[PDB]
Subunit: 72 residues, 12 copies
């Protein structure tokens, strides 16, 4: 679970959204008259009508994650 | 769970949103007459109509996360 | 759970929002006549119509998090 | 749970919001005639119509967090 | 739970809000005829129509937090 | 779970969205009169009408993840 | 232009209005940088959101009117 | 132009209106940079969102009108 | 222009109005930088959000009017 | 132009309106940079979203009108 | 132009309207950069989304009208 | 132009409308850069999404009209 990014030194980014009656549901748990429900979310969740990820790593960049589930 | 980012040294970013009746639900638990529900969220959740992540790492950048679930 | 970021030295950022009847629900637990509900949230949750994260790491930057759940 | 950020040395940021009947609910627990509910929130939650996070780390910056749940 | 940030040395930030009938609810617990409810909040929660966090770390900056729950 | 990216040194990005009655559901669990449901999500999930990932790695960039499930 | 109504002898009326931002313009003359305008109105004009005319003639009733325009 | 109504002798009326942003324009003359306009109205004009005319003649009732235009 | 009504002999009326930001303009002449305007009104004009005319003629009733315009 | 109605003697009326952003324009003259316009209206004009005319003649009822236009 | 209706003597009426963004234009004259326009209307014009005319003549009822146009 | 209706003596009417973005244009004259237009309307014009005419003549009822156009 180690992330390293070292940088040694010796544009137009447009997002245009025009929505009418836009409904966004991310991590959602909807139920009625149920018994049990498990919602295990361990990561980076992006949800939406205009989901833009521009130039996420431009220089030295390190991305890491770790999830698990132990029930025995 | 270690993050390191060292930087040694020796633009236009536009977001335009125009929404009409925009409904955003992030981490939501909706129920009626239910018995049990588990909502385990351990990460960075982005939810919405105009979800823009521009130039998230520009220089030296380190991103890390760690989730788990132990019930035995 | 260690974050380190060292920097040694030897633009226009616009967000425009125009919403009509905008409803945002973040971490929400809505119920009626239910018995039990668990809402375990341990991370950085961003929820909304104009959710903009511009230049989150520009220089030396370190991001980390750690979540868990022990019930035995 | 250690955060370190050392910096050694030897723009226009606009947010424009125009909302009509804007309703924002953050960490909310709404119920009627229920028995038990648990709302465990341990992280930095951002909720709203114009949620802007610009230049969060510009120089040397360290971000960390730690959550848990023990019931046995 | 240690935060350190040392800095050794040897722009226009605009927020514009124009809201009509804006309702903001932060950490809220609304109930009627219920039995028990637990609202455990241990982190920095930002809730609102114009939620702007500009230049949160500009120089040397250290952010940390720690939450927990023990019931046995 | 180690990510490393080191960089040593010695354009127009447009997204245009115009949606009418756009409904986005990300990680969603919808049920009625059910008994048990498991929703195990450990990765970076992108969901939406205009899902754009431009120039995700531009310089030195490292991406990693790790998921698991133990029930015994 | 003669009206006569002679009567020889030998209930619940509900109006319910609930308006939000109701704008009513009756006989209106709106102009800018114009030269000439003629507004000749000679009759009974009813204008409005809840325009109710219940039981206008219940017994002996006589209604008459007369308009004209002479310019030669 | 004679109206006569003679009567010799020897219920629930509900109107329910619930409007949101209701705009009513009756006899209206809107112009800009025009030269001449004639608005000749000689009759009973009813204009509106809830225009109800219930039981206008219940007993002996006489309705009459007369309009004209002479220019030669 | 003669009105006659002779009567020889030998209920609940409810109006309910609940308005928010209600604007009523009756006989109105609005102008800017204009030259000439004529507003000739000779009749009974009723203008408004809750314009109710209940039981206008109940017994012997006579209504009459007369308008004209001579310019030669 | 004579109306006569003589009567010799020897229920639930519901209107329900629920409108959202309802715009009603009756007798309207809209122009820009025009030269001449004639609007000759001599009759009973009913204009609107919920235009109800119930039981207009119930007993003895007489309706008449007369219009004309002379220009020579 | 004579109307006569004599009557000698010896139910549920429901209208339900539920509109969203309802636009009604009755007698309308819309122009730009035009020269001349004639709008001659002499009759009873009913215009709208829910235009209901129930039981217009129930007893003795007389309806008449007369229009013309002379230009020579 | 004579109407007569004499009556000598010796149910559920439902209209249900549910419209979304309903646009009704009755007698309309729309033009741009035109020279001349004539709109001669002399009759009873009914225009709309839910145009219902139920039981227009139930008892003794007389309907008449007369139009013309003289230009020579």
């Amino acid at each position: 679970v180690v992330a390293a990014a070292e940088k040694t030194k010796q544009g137009v980014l447009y997002v245009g959204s025009k929505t009418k009656e836009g409904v966004v549901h991310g991590v959602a748990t909807v139920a009625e008259k149920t018994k049990e429900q498990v919602t295990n979310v361990g990561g980076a969740v992006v949800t939406g009508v205009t989901a833009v990820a521009q130039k996420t790593v431009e220089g030295a960049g390190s991305i890491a994650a770790a999830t698990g589930f132990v029930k025995k």
